Structure formats: C-alpha cells, structure tokens
Amino acid sequence: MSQFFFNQRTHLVSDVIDGAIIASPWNNLARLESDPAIRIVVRRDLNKNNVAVISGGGSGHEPAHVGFIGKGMLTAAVCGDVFASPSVDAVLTAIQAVTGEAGCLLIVKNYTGDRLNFGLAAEKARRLGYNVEMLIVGDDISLPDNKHPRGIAGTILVHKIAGYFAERGYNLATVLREAQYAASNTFSLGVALSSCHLPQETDAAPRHHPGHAELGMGIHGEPGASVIDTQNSAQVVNLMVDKLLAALPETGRLAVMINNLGGVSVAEMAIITRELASSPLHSRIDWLIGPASLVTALDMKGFSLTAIVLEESIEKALLTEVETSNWPTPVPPREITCVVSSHASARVEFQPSANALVAGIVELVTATLSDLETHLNALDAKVGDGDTGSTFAAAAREIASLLHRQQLPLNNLATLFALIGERLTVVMGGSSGVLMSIFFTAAGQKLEQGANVVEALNTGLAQMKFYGGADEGDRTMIDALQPALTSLLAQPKNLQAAFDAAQAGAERTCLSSKANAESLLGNMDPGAQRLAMVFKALAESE
Amino acid sequence: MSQFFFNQRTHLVSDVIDGAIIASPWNNLARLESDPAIRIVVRRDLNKNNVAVISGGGSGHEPAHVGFIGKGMLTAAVCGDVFASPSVDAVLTAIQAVTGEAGCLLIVKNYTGDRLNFGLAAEKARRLGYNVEMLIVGDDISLPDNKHPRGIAGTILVHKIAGYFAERGYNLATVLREAQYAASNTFSLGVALSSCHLPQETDAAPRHHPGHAELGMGIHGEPGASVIDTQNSAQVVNLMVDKLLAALPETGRLAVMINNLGGVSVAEMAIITRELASSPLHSRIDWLIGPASLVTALDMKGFSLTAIVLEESIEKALLTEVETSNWPTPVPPREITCVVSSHASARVEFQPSANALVAGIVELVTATLSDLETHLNALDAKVGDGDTGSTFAAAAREIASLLHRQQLPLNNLATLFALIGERLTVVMGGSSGVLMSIFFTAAGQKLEQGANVVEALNTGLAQMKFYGGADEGDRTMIDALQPALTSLLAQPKNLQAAFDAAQAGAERTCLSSKANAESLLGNMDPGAQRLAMVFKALAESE
C-alpha cells in the first residue's frame, strides 16, 4: 500500500535531514549531537549575541523548516517525526543549544501538538533563566468558523521578517513585535486534488474527489473547508482569489507566494501562476514568491496562495538576501513581451518548364506508386496500419497532378526536387511524408551544389538515415533503396542492375519479418517493395 | 478522470509558457510572435554574433526547456503540445528567428518525432543558407538492447556545455564537437513508482506496480526496462548505482544530477540524496546537481540519476554561471557535521522537607483525584476516550507516592510545584499531562518570583490557556478552574466560595454538551468535575 521512497521507517526523518545537509548550498547546516529521538538542525553561523529564532514541528513539509535555517532566517529547526510534533525534550535542547542572553523567539504553526510541546519547553526554559517568546502562526483562511486557524505556507514569510530583525541585533521584544505584525498581515488558502502518500501501509488510497478539488485540505491531510465541482485552473484560482480579497485590506500593495504542496507538475504550477496574474488580485501585486515547493505536505497534489500586505517594514524585510537552502528571491510579475523576427518565405520558388525525359520519369514513377495503393496497404496491414499504400499514393498523385497541370519545373532537377520535398509532407501524413520530404529536400540541395542525380539521391538517403535512425536490415524502404543507389553509383546507367539490387533487398525484408506467429511474400515491407517496383518500372523502360 | 490543473486543453502549453515568463528571474524570456500553433520562447539577449543553441520537443518536462533559455545556455526552445513533438514549421521559424551567419546547433532528445521534425527543419534551413548542425542526445542506459537510447534528464547537461562555448564566440563546429563530447560522457537512469497524470480523460489510472518500482520508465510514460520488487530507497538507489558504474569509465571524477520527475516528495528526494552519498559511487563525486525538478514527466512519481564524466572542459563548463530560470548551481556533497552544545540539566533539584499543612493538602488533593478514576473515565467515555480518570489518577498517585515516601520538598511550594510540573508529563500521557505540567511549571515559577499561591495558580491557568487554546465555555477543566481561581483572588481564604464557583462552571459544561444525539450529569466534562471535586474536598476540610 505504501508508495514512498524510504529505508527504515524509524530513520526516515533522520535520513531526510542528512540529505538536506548533503545538499546545503551554503554548507551552513549542522545536526546537533543528541539522543536519536531528538532531531535538531542548527546553523554553523551561531551568533548568540543576536536573538535566536527557532521553529520546527512535524516533518513532511520539507524544505520547511530546515531549508529556512541560516543568516537572515531560522537559527534552528526542531524536527518531529512525519506529521508528528517534536518532543518537549527536543525543543528545550534546541533552546539551550543556541540561545544566549538575547533570548529566543519560538515560531509555531497553529497545531495543538506543537503549541503544547514548544509551550512546556518555553516554560522549562524560562525556569532556567532563558528569555523566551512564542508566536503561534495561524494564516489559513479556509475555515472562518474555526477558532484556531491552521498555520501553513505563510509561516515562512513570518520567519523572513523575524529573521531580518534578529540578525540586525534588535531585541527579543522587537523581533516578536514585528513577527506578530507580519503574521497578522499574512493570509493563505490552499487547494488539493488528492491527499499525500504516507510512508506506511494504509486503509485506503489518498483522499480524492474525482473531477473535483478539496479547498482547504490541511498540510497534514486534514479535511478542508469545501469541495469545488471542477479542477479548472481559472475557476479554482479565481475562487481562491475572491476569498483572499475578502480577508485582505481593501487597499495596499501585496507580495504573493505560490506554493506547491508537493504533487503538482511544474507545468501546472506555471498555469496556476498565469491564472493568478490574470486574477482581480493582479493590480496589487508587486512581488511573486514561487511557484516553488516551499511548505509541503509530502507529495500532496495541491497548491497554496499566500498574500502578505506590504505595510511598513514588511517589504524591506522580504527583499533582503538571506543564506538558506530554499528561500526563493521574490520577483515582480513580468509582463509577457512578444518578439517579432525577420523570416524569409520558406516556400520554394520555381517556374514551370518542360523536359520530355524528366516528365517521362516523373509520370512513370508517379503511376507505379499510385497503382500499388491497395497492394501496399495489404502488406502494411500485416503488422503496420495498412495505409502505407495510401500515404505513398497520396504523394504520387500530388506530384502527378502538378505534372498533369504543367506546373512542374521539369527542366531543373534541383528546383524540382526541392519542390517535391516541400509538397510531400503536406499531402503525406506521418513519418513517411517527413522522411520523403527530407530525402528530396536534401537531394535537391545536393544537386544545387552541382552534383549528379545519383550523388544527390544518395545524400538524400544518407539524411533520411541520420534522422530516421534506420539501417539496412531494419525492414524499411532503405533495404531496397540503398542497394539500388549503390548499384547506380557503380553503373550510373544500368537500371536493370539497380532494380535487381533493390529487389534482393526487398526480399531480405521478407525473411527478417517477426510478425508470423510458404513464399513469405506477404511479410514484405511496403516501403521496400514500393521502391523495388519503382526501379523495376524504370529498368523496363530502357 | 483527469486529475490536472488546467483551463482550455488547446491553450495548455501556451498557458505554461506565459506562466514561465511571468516568473522569469532574469526577465530575459520572450514569446515569439507567430501562428498560435507555433510555440517558441526566445531570449531577449539575442546576440546573433554567437552561435545559436536551439532545443525543445514535446511539453510536460518543465522546467525543460524554457527554464534553460538564457546567457550561457539555450538561445530558444521550441515547445510542442504535451508529450508531442513541435511542428517542422515551428522549428524552422525558431532557426530563422535567432540564427545569424554563425549558425545554430539543434540539440534534440532521442525520439522519432523530434528527430524527424527538427531534421526536416534543418534541411529546409540549409536550403535557405543557414549553417545548421544537429546533436541527438540519448543518455538513457536502462535499455542496453535498444538501438536508440532515449534522451532524458542528462540532455540539459549537454545544453550547459554547448552554451558555454556558444556564448564565448566559438564556432559552430566547436560547439557541436564539445556538445557531442559532453553527450558521450553523460549517463542517466530513471525509476518510477507510478506514471503521470495526463491533462485528459483516460482509460485507466497511471501505470503503477503495488509495492514495486518500474526501472527505466520513460519521460513520456513509456514502458521501462524492468520492475524492482521493492520501493526501498537504499536498494533502489544502489541497484541504479551499479548500472551507472557499469556504464561509466572505471576511473575519473563525476558530477551527479538528482532529478525529480515531478511527483516525489522533497522529503523523499532528500533520502534519495542520502542514499546516493552512501553508494559505491560516493568516492568519485565532486559535484551534486539537485535534488530538483529539472527535466520532468508532469507529476510522475519517480526520479533520475545522471552521471557526467569530468574530463577536459566539461567541469569548467558545468561550473560557469548562466542566466536561466532554473539552472541549479552545482554543490559539492557536504559532509554531515555534528555540533555539540552546553546544556544545563533540566532536572529540577530539591531536598525533601516536611510541612504538615501542605502535606495535608497534597494528600487530600491527591486522594480525591485518585478515588475518581472510574467515574471520570465513565464521563470521558461519552465522547472522549474514557481514560481521563486514569490519566489524572496516574498523576495523582505519582505525587501521592512521592508524598508517602517522604520525597517531596513540602516546605517550599515553588520547588514543590516545579517538581510536580516536571513529574506529571512523565506519568500522564497525552495533552492532559502536558497541560498540567505547563500549569504547575509556570505556577512554580510565579511563586519563585515571590507571588502568593493564588497568584501563581492563576498564572498557571493563564499559561495553560495560551498554549492549550481553550477558553471558558469550551468544556474543559478551565470552566471550573478559572471561576475558582477568580473566587479565591477576591476571597483568598473562602474555600467554600471557590468550590461553589468551580461547581457552577462544571455544571455549565453539562449544558453545552453536543454529544447527546434528564439531569444531564452524564454530559459533564471530566476535567471540570475533577476540578470541582478537588475544591469541594478542600472546602470540606475547613
């Protein structure tokens, strides 16, 4: 039932911590020696002269909170087990470990377990002479009737402000004051299509509503505030924006954080970002934080939108650089500029011209392929889609038509090939059309460089092989074409030899035919056969 | 069926592009004016004097490739629909739009659709005089028997090297040479627990093998090379490391990229990072790229490991700063340092002392609670877990025992309270224990500041409320405690009044009792009742 990458369940959180450290951009993180049941990460920049800002809580919201430890933000983070509050002992240990006379501010997300455990910790700390303050963050607005708003993504915006002042030597009282001020100006709303996968065997797959979306699903998977009858990005985001606007002051600039709860695709997150930029909330946004996975719920497929009012010191504090593994640098929503380029008409130019010889070839090649439609479909039907005959016929007739309408530059092969190369893909769908267009386009160009027909045709083959990836023996027209083009390269005028070569190659494709679970002529590749018949026709006209 | 955030299916990719631009860190991205069916993103830093490096392919791998467009990397990216190759027209348009005499290098992931479409494009470009080169990247090693290795995450490492040389004015030939050299030294292997959710109605949920993992699942959800009978992070990573080692040179330094296909939790990604750091591959790693979502498969819950050999110019080129939305700065795997702190024994010190008065109170309070065990469980059983009586009895007896063993500092309330506060949570499990410990700890400290008992008890209540979050009327012991403590604050010695107050409060909890779907005494909160009986006992001893 467990769909989770992990090793020993009991070492889960510890392993996450090791990984976070191993990838530390600043290499400013360090575990704190302690009993295995205490999981504290602290910064190596320990400057007890400044006020310590400690945070934490149950794990499963990485990069929170370890990812926000460092200069300008969190001093330490107390990590509980997955979605489980840290022990009182653990919290105390962190306080004593990084708190100097300046004191420390505990930033706690609104959840009983954390409030009670960090709380008893603060109390035990105070008895030991430490100066402690606690700020409970409850930024969720999904449940108006809730006495205790849950603390979610916005919490880190609180870390940011608290960190600003703490690093700059302001006193505990000031840190708390400002931190509380930020909290009071932070509003978040989340939505999810499905809950998260837990690192354990469960009773039922993650909660999910088909075609719908649960507004307000908690970061621990808690029941949300409602269910939206659609997953449409615009509808979902605008609904969220309305509720955000109803909670925000009617005026003032805003910073908005687009947080990925863990399971939304980057593509989706981009679309969400676009919706937000087009929402009624748009004209008041001066900064975007994300889209990014900042405060997650394991792999929960949902996202959250956090709006913080930019009053007073808030904005100054948000924009200050810090040194953490995951703080994202705020960015003003950029406008979508549209660049214009100077592109020459791809369309190949030409002037109809006669040449009885060439016309005779074009007519012959053209007819042979056209006549083979049903036979080539039959061969293709064996394993393919039974349409190769029609695809090839489509191209033949297109060039035949142009021929019959005296529209071909028959007197100039280079331009003629270039013209066919341009027209085939338009009438021939699928890889066949593209490959043939590649063939003639490259051939037409080799001729433009003044090469003889056979040389150009071989270059066409060479290019068809490079892009197509096929080789002699893979059962495609190549198996008959190459032999023929090689035959002609030695005997430029011996059409009988060319045909014979192509014919042998086509025959080889009947052997290596896997699909066959007597004469085996029904296992012949249509491409090769078509090719062999073309040369056969050419050889019989000489 | 569709579990995807999007609006109009036909505008999906376009909306993703808009969002990518809106969030552009460098604001160096711009859409290219064109037919709606052509989706090209180009850099505003267009310097046609240098060789252009174009990429792209089907969408759903964000941030690739739009996220690697910029100085030092991609010049432009051609975006097809979700998991569908861009049109030939589209690719050409990009070439003509950003290519100067210096020419351009097309970097294509190994997939027919892309090879054929970028291919015909290159051919049509060459006829127009542009100098073009194409490098097909096939870094996947999951399918040894495959003639055409799929191109996955490693592709961007190729963009990095190509970009290095192109920005520095080297010629096309050199760009291609180096780009090919990087490719040849790039090896990737992916694994997934489930395929991705598509932006459409489907026949069945994403492919998934319960308890197992599909090794080599493609970035388009293509069938992998095998199925691992476990999801264990260590086993899975070591298996992958073996195969990587079998493909890598037996010696040489390495850069390893840990890519999140889109649906793995950040926690999981950290654990994976730890496994890699402990794998036999460990001693040859000088740089880590990620964990991060770099080349995704929508929300596919899997990850990939790419190893690139650091020979010649590779390392120099990897470490150069570039200007893109998502290139991650490589980091040396940090070692996990363990810090030591100086923490004073939390354990409260005391010396047994007598005091008949206090002892009489402790005995009385202690007994009353103990006697009420079964009755309080009965009340708690109504809606709670029916254990409050036992939890409270557990604490009572613990303090009674200490009392009976002449172990209490009876002559010093401050230390006595501090001692009880320390011992309750140890014997009382759950929030009840923590709350009571909070109460006494804070009370003991208020006394230490030289306050009278009633004042200290009120501070205890105040702290219990702050952390506990409960208020008068929420149906907890507070409903009886507060009234009593307030009564005593006015009449310090009138125990009868205190009891009566507590009793009224306990009675109030019988009314607001929701659970009841006569006398209503069975709807009384255990906490409140326990509290009322304590005071009743005190009042009856005077």
Ligand SMILES: CCCCCCCCCCCCCCCC(=O)OC[C@H](COP(=O)(O)O)OC(=O)CCCCCCCCCCCCC
């Ligand atoms: C899928 C639909 C494709 C539709 C293709 C239509 C166009 C067919 C190709 C027209 C070729 C015109 C060749 C012009 C004749 C020529 O080059 O004469 C010069 C040379 C030497 O002089 P001589 O002819 O007077 O003795 O002629 C030759 O060397 C003979 C070689 C002829 C090779 C023909 C190959 C045709 C392409 C086969 C493609 C098959 C695709 C299924």
Ligand SMILES: CCCCCCCCCCCCCCCC(=O)OC[C@H](COP(=O)(O)O)OC(=O)CCCCCCCCCCCCC
């Ligand atoms: C369900 C949990 C209920 C918790 C109730 C706590 C009840 C405390 C009872 C205190 C009686 C009220 C004080 C009366 C005024 C007074 O002054 O009494 C005289 C004396 C000295 O006061 P002074 O120094 O200010 O002049 O007060 C005392 O001696 C207080 C003795 C406290 C004994 C506490 C026993 C605690 C047992 C905890 C068991 C926990 C089980 C979960």
